[PDB]
Design a protein around this ligand. Sequence first.
Ligand code: NA
Lengths: 293, 33
Amino acid sequence: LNIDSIIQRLLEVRGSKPGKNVQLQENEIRGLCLKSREIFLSQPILLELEAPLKICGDIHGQYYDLLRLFEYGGFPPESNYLFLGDYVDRGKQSLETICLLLAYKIKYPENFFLLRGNHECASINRIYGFYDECKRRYNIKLWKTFTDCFNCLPIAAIVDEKIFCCHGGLSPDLQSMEQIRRIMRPTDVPDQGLLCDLLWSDPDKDVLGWGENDRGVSFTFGAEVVAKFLHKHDLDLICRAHQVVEDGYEFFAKRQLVTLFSAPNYCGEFDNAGAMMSVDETLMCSFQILKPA
Amino acid sequence: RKRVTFGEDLSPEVFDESLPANTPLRKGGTPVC
Ligand code: NA
C-alpha cells in the first residue's frame, strides 16, 4: 500500500474542471479500509483531543468541495482535523471523498480524526447513494469492506475537556462518558440507544426536555438539556453536524451548541454555505466559511 | 484555565462551483491567535 501515491492521485484533480473521477485500484481501496480500520480500533471510541484543530461537519461525497475546504483550512498536516461524519451518500463522489479521508487517517494517525456519522452505516448508505456508487464503479464486495471499516469508527470526541463533539447530538441515556467508552467495536448502528442518539439526535427550540424526532429515529432535545449536560460534565460547548444550516454554522441555546455543515449548496438543492470551526490553543473558536458565488 | 470563547467574524472564502478547487474567487479570512 503506497499511501503517498494514493494521496497524490486523489489530489491530482485539484486543478481539474470539477467532477472528474479518480479511479484507484480496488485492492488499494481495500487496503485503505483495512489499514484505517486497524488504526480506528487502536484508538479510543471516545477520542480525547487537544487544540489547535479544525472541525468539519458533513461532506456527503462533495469531493471538490472537500478539496476547496482543505485549500482554505490548510491541507493535512498543516492543520489538525476532526471530521464529524457523513463522508458518503447524496453527493456524486463518495468514493474519492472517503478514500482521501482514510488515506489522511493512515498518513497522519495522531493529527487527523474521523467520527462516525449516521451515513456510515450499511442500512442508510444502501439507499442514499454509496452502495450504488460502489456497485457501479467497483463491486458489492468493496461496499461490504467499507461497512466493516465504518463499523470501527469512533463516535465522539472531547477537545481539551471542554468541547464535546459528535455527529448527531445528546442522548437521554448519556449520564457518564464511560458509557461511550464501554461500547465495543466493530458494531452496526442499532435502531435505538446511546450510539444511535449520538449519530442521530437533533436540537429543537420548541422541545422542553426530550421529544419526538420526525426522522423516525432517536430524539430531539431542548436548550435546557444542553445547559444541564454542559454543567454536569464541566463542558463549554457541544459541536455537532447532521443538519443543513444556511450559513454553514448555527448556534443553539445561547452559544452552548453549534451545528456545522460543510457541504455548500448541498445536493444542488439548498442555499447554504459550508463551514468549519477552527479552535486555537486557547480554545478561541472561529468559523471559516466556504461560500458559493 | 482554558475556556471556550469566540473569535471575530472571518470573511468567507468564495468559490465558483464550475472552477477548479485550487482557484478560489476570493480568499477568506484566516484566524490568528
Ligand atoms: Na474526557
